[PDB]
Amino acid sequence: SIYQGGNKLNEDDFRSHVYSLCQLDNVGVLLGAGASVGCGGKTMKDVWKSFKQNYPELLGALIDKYLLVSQIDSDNNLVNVELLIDEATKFLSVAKTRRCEDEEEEFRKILSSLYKEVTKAALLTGEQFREKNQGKKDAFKYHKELISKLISNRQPGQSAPAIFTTNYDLALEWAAEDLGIQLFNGFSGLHTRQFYPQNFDLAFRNVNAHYHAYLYKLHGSLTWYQNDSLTVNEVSASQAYDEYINDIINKDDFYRGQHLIYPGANKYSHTIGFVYGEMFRRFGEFISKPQTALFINGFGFGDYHINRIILGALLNPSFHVVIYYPELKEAITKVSKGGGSEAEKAIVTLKNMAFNQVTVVGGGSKAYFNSFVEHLPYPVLFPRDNIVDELVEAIANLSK
Amino acid sequence: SIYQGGNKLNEDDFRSHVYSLCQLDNVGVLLGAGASVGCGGKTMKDVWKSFKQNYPELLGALIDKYLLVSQIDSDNNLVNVELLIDEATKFLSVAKTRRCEDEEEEFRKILSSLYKEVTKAALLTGEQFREKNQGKKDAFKYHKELISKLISNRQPGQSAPAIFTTNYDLALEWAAEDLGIQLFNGFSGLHTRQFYPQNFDLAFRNVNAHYHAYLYKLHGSLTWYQNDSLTVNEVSASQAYDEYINDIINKDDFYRGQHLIYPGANKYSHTIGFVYGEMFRRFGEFISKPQTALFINGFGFGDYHINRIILGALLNPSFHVVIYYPELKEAITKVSKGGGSEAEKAIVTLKNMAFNQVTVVGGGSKAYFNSFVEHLPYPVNIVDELVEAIANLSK
Amino acid sequence: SIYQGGNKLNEDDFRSHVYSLCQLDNVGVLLGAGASVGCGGKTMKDVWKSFKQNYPELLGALIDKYLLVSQIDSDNNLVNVELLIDEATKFLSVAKTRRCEDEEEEFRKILSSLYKEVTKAALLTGEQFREKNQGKKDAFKYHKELISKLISNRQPGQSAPAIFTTNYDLALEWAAEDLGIQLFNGFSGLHTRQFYPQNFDLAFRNVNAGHYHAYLYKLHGSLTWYQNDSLTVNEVSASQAYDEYINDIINKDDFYRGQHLIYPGANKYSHTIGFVYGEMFRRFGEFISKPQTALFINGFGFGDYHINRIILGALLNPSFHVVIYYPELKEAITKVSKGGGSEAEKAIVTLKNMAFNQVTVVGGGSKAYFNSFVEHLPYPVLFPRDNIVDELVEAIANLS
Amino acid sequence: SIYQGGNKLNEDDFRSHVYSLCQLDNVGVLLGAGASVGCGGKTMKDVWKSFKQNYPELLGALIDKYLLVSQIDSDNNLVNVELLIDEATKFLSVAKTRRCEDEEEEFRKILSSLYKEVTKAALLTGEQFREKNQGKKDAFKYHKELISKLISNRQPGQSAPAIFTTNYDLALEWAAEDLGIQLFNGFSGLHTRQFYPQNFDLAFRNVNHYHAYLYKLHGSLTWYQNDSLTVNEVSASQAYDEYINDIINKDDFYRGQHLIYPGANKYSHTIGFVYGEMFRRFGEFISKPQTALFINGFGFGDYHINRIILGALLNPSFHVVIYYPELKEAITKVSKGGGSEAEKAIVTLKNMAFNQVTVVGGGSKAYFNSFVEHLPYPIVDELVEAIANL
Amino acid sequence: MSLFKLTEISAIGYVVGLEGERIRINLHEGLQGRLASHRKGVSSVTQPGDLIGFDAGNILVVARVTDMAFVIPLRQIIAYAIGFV
Ligand SMILES: Nc1ncnc2c1ncn2[C@@H]1O[C@H](COP(=O)(O)OP(=O)(O)OC[C@H]2O[C@H](O)[C@H](O)[C@@H]2O)[C@@H](O)[C@H]1O
Ligand SMILES: Nc1ncnc2c1ncn2[C@@H]1O[C@H](COP(=O)(O)OP(=O)(O)OC[C@H]2O[C@H](O)[C@H](O)[C@@H]2O)[C@@H](O)[C@H]1O
Ligand SMILES: Nc1ncnc2c1ncn2[C@@H]1O[C@H](COP(=O)(O)OP(=O)(O)OC[C@H]2O[C@H](O)[C@H](O)[C@@H]2O)[C@@H](O)[C@H]1O
Numbered sequence A: 001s002i003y004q005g006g007n008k009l010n011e012d013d014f015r016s017h018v019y020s021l022c023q024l025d026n027v028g029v030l031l032g033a034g035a036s037v038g039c040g041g042k043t044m045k046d047v048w049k050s051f052k053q054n055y056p057e058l059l060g061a062l063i064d065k066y067l068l069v070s071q072i073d074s075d076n077n078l079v080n081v082e083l084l085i086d087e088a089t090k091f092l093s094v095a096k097t098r099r100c101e102d103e104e105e106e107f108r109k110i111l112s113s114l115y116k117e118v119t120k121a122a123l124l125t126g127e128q129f130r131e132k133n134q135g136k137k138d139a140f141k142y143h144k145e146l147i148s149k150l151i152s153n154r155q156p157g158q159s160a161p162a163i164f165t166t167n168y169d170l171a172l173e174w175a176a177e178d179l180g181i182q183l184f185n186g187f188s189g190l191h192t193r194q195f196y197p198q199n200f201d202l203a204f205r206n207v208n209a210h211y212h213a214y215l216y217k218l219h220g221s222l223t224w225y226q227n228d229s230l231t232v233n234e235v236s237a238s239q240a241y242d243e244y245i246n247d248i249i250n251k252d253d254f255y256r257g258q259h260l261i262y263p264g265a266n267k268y269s270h271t272i273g274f275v276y277g278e279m280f281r282r283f284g285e286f287i288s289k290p291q292t293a294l295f296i297n298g299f300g301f302g303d304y305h306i307n308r309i310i311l312g313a314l315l316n317p318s319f320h321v322v323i324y325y326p327e328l329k330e331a332i333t334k335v336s337k338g339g340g341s342e343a344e345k346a347i348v349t350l351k352n353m354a355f356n357q358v359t360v361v362g363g364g365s366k367a368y369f370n371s372f373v374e375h376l377p378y379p380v381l382f383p384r385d386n387i388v389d390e391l392v393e394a395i396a397n398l399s400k
Numbered sequence B: 001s002i003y004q005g006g007n008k009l010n011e012d013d014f015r016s017h018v019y020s021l022c023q024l025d026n027v028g029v030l031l032g033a034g035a036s037v038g039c040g041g042k043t044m045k046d047v048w049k050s051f052k053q054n055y056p057e058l059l060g061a062l063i064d065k066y067l068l069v070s071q072i073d074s075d076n077n078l079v080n081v082e083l084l085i086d087e088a089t090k091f092l093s094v095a096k097t098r099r100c101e102d103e104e105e106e107f108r109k110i111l112s113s114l115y116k117e118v119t120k121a122a123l124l125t126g127e128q129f130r131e132k133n134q135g136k137k138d139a140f141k142y143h144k145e146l147i148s149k150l151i152s153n154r155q156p157g158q159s160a161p162a163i164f165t166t167n168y169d170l171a172l173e174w175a176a177e178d179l180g181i182q183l184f185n186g187f188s189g190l191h192t193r194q195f196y197p198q199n200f201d202l203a204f205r206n207v208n209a210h211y212h213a214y215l216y217k218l219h220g221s222l223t224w225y226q227n228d229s230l231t232v233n234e235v236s237a238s239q240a241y242d243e244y245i246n247d248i249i250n251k252d253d254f255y256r257g258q259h260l261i262y263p264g265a266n267k268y269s270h271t272i273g274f275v276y277g278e279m280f281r282r283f284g285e286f287i288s289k290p291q292t293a294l295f296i297n298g299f300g301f302g303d304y305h306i307n308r309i310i311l312g313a314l315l316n317p318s319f320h321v322v323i324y325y326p327e328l329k330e331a332i333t334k335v336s337k338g339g340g341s342e343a344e345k346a347i348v349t350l351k352n353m354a355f356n357q358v359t360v361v362g363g364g365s366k367a368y369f370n371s372f373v374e375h376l377p378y379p380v381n382i383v384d385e386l387v388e389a390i391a392n393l394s395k
Numbered sequence C: 001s002i003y004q005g006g007n008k009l010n011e012d013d014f015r016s017h018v019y020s021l022c023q024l025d026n027v028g029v030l031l032g033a034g035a036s037v038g039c040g041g042k043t044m045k046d047v048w049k050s051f052k053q054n055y056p057e058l059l060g061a062l063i064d065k066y067l068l069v070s071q072i073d074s075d076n077n078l079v080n081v082e083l084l085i086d087e088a089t090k091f092l093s094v095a096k097t098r099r100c101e102d103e104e105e106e107f108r109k110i111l112s113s114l115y116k117e118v119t120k121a122a123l124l125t126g127e128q129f130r131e132k133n134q135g136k137k138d139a140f141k142y143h144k145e146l147i148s149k150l151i152s153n154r155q156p157g158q159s160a161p162a163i164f165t166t167n168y169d170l171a172l173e174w175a176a177e178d179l180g181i182q183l184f185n186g187f188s189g190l191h192t193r194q195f196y197p198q199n200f201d202l203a204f205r206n207v208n209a210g211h212y213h214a215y216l217y218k219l220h221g222s223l224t225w226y227q228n229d230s231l232t233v234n235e236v237s238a239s240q241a242y243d244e245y246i247n248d249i250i251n252k253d254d255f256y257r258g259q260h261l262i263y264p265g266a267n268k269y270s271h272t273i274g275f276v277y278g279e280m281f282r283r284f285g286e287f288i289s290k291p292q293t294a295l296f297i298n299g300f301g302f303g304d305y306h307i308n309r310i311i312l313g314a315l316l317n318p319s320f321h322v323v324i325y326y327p328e329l330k331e332a333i334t335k336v337s338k339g340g341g342s343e344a345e346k347a348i349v350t351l352k353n354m355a356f357n358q359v360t361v362v363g364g365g366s367k368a369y370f371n372s373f374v375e376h377l378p379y380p381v382l383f384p385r386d387n388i389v390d391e392l393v394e395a396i397a398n399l400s
Numbered sequence D: 001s002i003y004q005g006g007n008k009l010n011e012d013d014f015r016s017h018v019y020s021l022c023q024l025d026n027v028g029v030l031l032g033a034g035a036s037v038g039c040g041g042k043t044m045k046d047v048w049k050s051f052k053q054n055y056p057e058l059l060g061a062l063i064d065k066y067l068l069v070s071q072i073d074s075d076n077n078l079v080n081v082e083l084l085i086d087e088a089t090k091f092l093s094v095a096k097t098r099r100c101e102d103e104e105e106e107f108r109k110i111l112s113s114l115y116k117e118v119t120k121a122a123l124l125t126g127e128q129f130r131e132k133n134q135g136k137k138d139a140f141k142y143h144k145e146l147i148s149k150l151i152s153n154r155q156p157g158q159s160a161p162a163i164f165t166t167n168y169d170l171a172l173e174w175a176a177e178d179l180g181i182q183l184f185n186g187f188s189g190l191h192t193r194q195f196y197p198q199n200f201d202l203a204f205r206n207v208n209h210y211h212a213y214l215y216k217l218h219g220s221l222t223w224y225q226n227d228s229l230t231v232n233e234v235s236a237s238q239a240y241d242e243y244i245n246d247i248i249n250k251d252d253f254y255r256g257q258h259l260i261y262p263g264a265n266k267y268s269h270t271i272g273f274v275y276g277e278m279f280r281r282f283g284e285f286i287s288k289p290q291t292a293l294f295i296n297g298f299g300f301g302d303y304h305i306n307r308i309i310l311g312a313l314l315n316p317s318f319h320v321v322i323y324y325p326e327l328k329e330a331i332t333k334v335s336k337g338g339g340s341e342a343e344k345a346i347v348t349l350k351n352m353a354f355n356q357v358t359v360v361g362g363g364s365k366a367y368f369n370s371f372v373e374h375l376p377y378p379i380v381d382e383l384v385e386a387i388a389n390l
Numbered sequence E: 001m002s003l004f005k006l007t008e009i010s011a012i013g014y015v016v017g018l019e020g021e022r023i024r025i026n027l028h029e030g031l032q033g034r035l036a037s038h039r040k041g042v043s044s045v046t047q048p049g050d051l052i053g054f055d056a057g058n059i060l061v062v063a064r065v066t067d068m069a070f071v072i073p074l075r076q077i078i079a080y081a082i083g084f085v
């Protein structure tokens, strides 16, 4: 259930490998959509279920006329909600170029009813998304322990920790506000708040001779919006729920770019963002430093851009990575029988290697977020050298 | 005919501004389609008036039936071919998906005809395309001076040169294997060659007692293709002529989809756009740095995304640019009296701007590639006869 | 069956010896034609057994009219091919200067049907030789592991590894073009590749101050190099060679010419234009003439006069170690007590019967094969438990 | 006529360039069958003359039956002889492999005469070959000076001189044995002497002497091969009694695959080793920087040596100094259609435009003896005779 | 490595000072052979009254020698300028 180098490993050596990893110069963590399941979050399968359960006519057009999704996959919940938002976007361009006025109106619905089941799944508390002090609830109990452990294990001279994520939800902000810890995110101001790339190079200091961290959101957020061509603006939850969120859930309007999220599969076609490209320049530059460690959790390995970075960063002798995947046994089988999808093949090529800088952890519920957070150590504030306390431990079994 | 600051400048001061610009920390060049005219190449309006001549019965559907082209610019020869191809490329996909056969059968006829014209013009040598040592010839003489000067004008412990290009030919690769230097292009291997982006961050050195440069192609090459679903491959000219570059030219209706990576054609796929995106990324990341100089030649200023990027970079006081444009006179005349295209308005505005960070050179034939290459500085071969002497010593 | 310095040692000290030989400045490996048997290759006995039952008319003539091979060794397949390929050239060089005109045409057949049988062996895959992604199969699983281990076992400052070989096949490029490792081999270019003796002194570097690489020396040539009347050596690919010159050799039945650069003969100093065959054997002797040097040998039958002299004359340096793998050691010690034996069963017994502790020999039949050699090699210990005070951790287990 | 690459010099203009080139790090000397005349040697032409007018009857088959030689160059007295020997060994080997009688005997009869005429010329003292202290004599007086000064003109911490050679005789050994310096040739032992290529990398050193190297290119009279595949060296007093005497005083007897001189039996994988291991060292010595090479006695009739010395010149810190006596007699023949590669190459060399090729000619002022004098400079008998008589 | 070479020229010394129309130059011993052959002729300037030159990328500066002196011991030169090419 734990592999390291293609061979097998056991718990009491894993727990001491993890301890040695957390004392390195650079430590990081990349999270996904499963991490936020024990808080009210959802997953893409459930998005598809919700879609085919509330809109039964568009689902009929989508199989009979245009032939974009099959019946086997629909009935057995295998569709990808990421390669469909692209085909539906491709049809619209043609229909609009050659001036048809019915297919240019039966696709806007299909495309605005999918952007609406993806926001409700990023609200974690419902109508109480607009209220205050939502990090005092007990669902957010392990997100605090993660941050506490990460920070506390740093000594003077070393750098602060980094956190990468794809989710749009607000779950680490809510939980760091409840401790008093500042997260740098690239924005500055309160009455008009804007993105400046050179706000990732700052740090704190005390003026009479401190805890902080960095957060990189790679696929956007729910509180960002663009008006001009070179001005992105941030806003709070209560001031967003009023303007442009309660008008695309409870009113059934057509969709225009109220907020910037990247849910599709080809994220370069959008050639106006200019903020997607500042995060990956930092990811790839983080992985290229000597003495670097990365933990991964919640990610399904279905993104063609991140896999290439991870796969090409393993040509450096001082980079370590740890990966959690619950459904590993059901993938080795399907790949030994000559099948498998592009996700299972990518993780099997990682499991089957000969470099001791890779480690994979299966086991179902043992590879969950709540268990990931308990494998991490607390620090020893004053370390007993213990030879008085160690030779006695020897005397215990020595004596008889 | 040389305006720096909106105020005329003379050739002998110009030729000394250049020598100072070529001493900075970052230096780069951006080329275009015109730079390949003294080697056997063509331009993007010749390519269109050689199409509407041979194929005049496909030029009625594209206007009256499917609305991809406009009569005004089709008559004035002001069409953009990249976008036309990239749109005809997805019409076909949609039809293939929804099972509309009669139109799927027609778009193949259209694309097998467009690719013929865009391919012929880009071999530069006809049937000798598939042979060796094509850079010994005399048409590639003004492509080696560029690369030799740009290198010899560098000091030790200093960045190497960068060349961005919009063509999809090999004039610039054939002319460095002769010299004997190494070009980085993001590929590696010989029996299976693949794209690795991290390669643009490497270099060479020596361990006992060596020259390289970087090449970025923004529109592709004749030598790249796709056969799997997640891997892009590169081959040699001889190995491509056999596979596909010959059927394209000497067969009528041969067309295989989602296979070719030129010119900017199949961009909806998520494995081919990955290749086009990194280049633009790296360009916009180079053009934004302290102590940077850029020379432009052969480019027509008809892209909306490059102009925005060049302008946004003039808010930094240590970026200098040099431009070349022959039809400046005819452009100013038309723009004065409320006219001109979006390509002339931009360059006229740049000419008018009151900056000392912009220089324009329009003199007709005086703004060409061969003059550009002699405006560069060189400071101030008896070792050859021996090799042919030895070759004469056969027996 | 492991003899060190003439004595015997066991498989618990052998391993701690290997683990200390792999921690030195210079490390290398010389391979042969047996290492390519677990992938589809063949040996010279097989070449002879396939020449016999395919060209029985000329074998008669060789035994009878020219007296080149004894009728005895034939029956038991004890013939050497590298002297038979050398005598025919001597015959053809006198028939020419004499101007006879019916022996040239009788020896060209014998010198073509004999070059045809090596290629078919050195292809290893038949018709899938002209295809791509050929190192993703299982056959090369033990070629990948060797490179992985040899690289991983280095440190900062130390020199990169080298690999010398005599075979013609590509079972060592195919395997690295899957991991993503770059092997240096002398050539440079894509559309016009050429041999330069100065790009053996090249290495990597980064720009923000690809750290895996190695070197490859082929000693007898390759199935992919060709010399042109331009007097240069050019390299092409395995799909551009098949369709160009090694599709006629097999199927055409035409006469031979120096189309590709292989020499299996015994004394190829005759070739005086062989300036590529003189850099390899200079680097080989410049390698073993350095302090703190280790070499492993596998797959070599010790029937080459040029290499054994180098091995011998290198033993007078006190900081040079060898390891050797010879399966038929018992059967060859038996055959020398009678004062008989071949000329290759003496060169190995001479080594096995020394008194210096810098020579180790391994027999055991199927225990000296390539797949056991690779498993005798270690993995590295990344975070070494200092365990001067956690030495008692070992006592902790059981003393009650 | 001191021509210097399209120019002209004078005695001192030369005699200072030599002092300049003698301060370099890598110094090298090259000698052929010319510098061996003052001591009693013969060129390649006299031996062919003698063979012609001593063994006429068998000279025909070489031109009529087996076609080894050309009548034109045979008459002109310009014919290479060691290649002929090499090829005849091959013929004999083939005719002995396939069991035939007449062609076997017909070549066993020719090898003897050839080896006879080629050994007599190189004995170099007659019947005082099997005796001691042959280097005290007067003929070996300039080699001693050469060695002494070429060694003395060296700095502390500098490399050692290199001497390549195309002869197969014992003069430079007899002379160094008189001086008292140590030569290295790649051999070791006294009761069983064997070849070790890696010995060229050794060097002496003191604890509380001087030496040099010697590279032969065609072999020697004291190297041979016994029934077992190892190559052995021997002394003259021993070789004379072993084989040479019969070679010189018996009409028909031959031993195949035994002797190693001159480039005779290269078709054996045990013998070509020791030839190739010299030429590759030559190459690796050339390819070094800050090197000088003095050529005195060679006739430039060799494809490979020409090619190597030609390719060597690309990098500029390799200097060449040729000696050639009969130069204008070829300058005045190259104007016309007649000419041989020997002279074509040297005139091509003198027609260069850089200051490295330094051809020299004086008819008799370009000789070994003057070559020696061109170089700089850094009672025992009475006492020993007194002790003797006392 | 590959074919491309850059260096062709050799020199005598390097500039070390400028004191008001008065140049100071330190001489070498690295160029063991102060001879440096080239296309047309050979030259070496080792006496007053002689002319020397300096390259400044785009132009050549021409100077005349005036003095020589000491301070293996060191040597120096003094020069003035007369124009450019
Ligand atoms: N409680 C849990 N704890 C940890 N992991 C879990 C849990 N429950 C399920 N899983 C695992 O969670 C995994 C399923 O995660 P997926 O639905 O693929 O999310 P994604 O992030 O990969 O892809 C979506 C993004 O991809 C694009 O980038 C878009 O931007 C999208 O935002 C499985 O392996 C489960 O075993
Ligand atoms: N010998 C010459 N030397 C230099 N320049 C020349 C020469 N001859 C003509 N010219 C100039 O060369 C220019 C040719 O302009 P175009 O054919 O548009 O070249 P492109 O590279 O912009 O076209 C591709 C773009 O089109 C799409 O917008 C895509 O975005 C592509 O980026 C003319 O203005 C001539 O003055
Ligand atoms: N599975 C195996 N694993 C390891 N070794 C094996 C295996 N099977 C057989 N062997 C051993 O592999 C060896 C095979 O002996 P030969 O075919 O003569 O090896 P070569 O490469 O020298 O032969 C050609 C070269 O020989 C000349 O030197 C020239 O250089 C030629 O290039 C035996 O010792 C087997 O015990």
Ligand SMILES: Nc1ncnc2c1ncn2[C@@H]1O[C@H](COP(=O)(O)OP(=O)(O)OC[C@H]2O[C@H](O)[C@H](O)[C@@H]2O)[C@@H](O)[C@H]1O
Pocket (backbone or CB within 6 Å): D032, D033, D034, D035, D037, D038, D043, D044, D045, D080, D166, D297, D298, D299, D300, D301, D302, D324, D325, D326, D366, D367, D368, D369
């Ligand atoms: N006293 C003297 N001092 C100096 N030079 C002399 C003297 N006497 C004659 N010479 C010159 O010495 C030269 C004698 O030339 P030759 O003996 O034929 O040439 P080689 O000794 O290199 O022959 C060996 C080659 O033969 C095969 O081809 C192999 O390839 C060998 O390489 C004349 O030019 C005289 O001017």
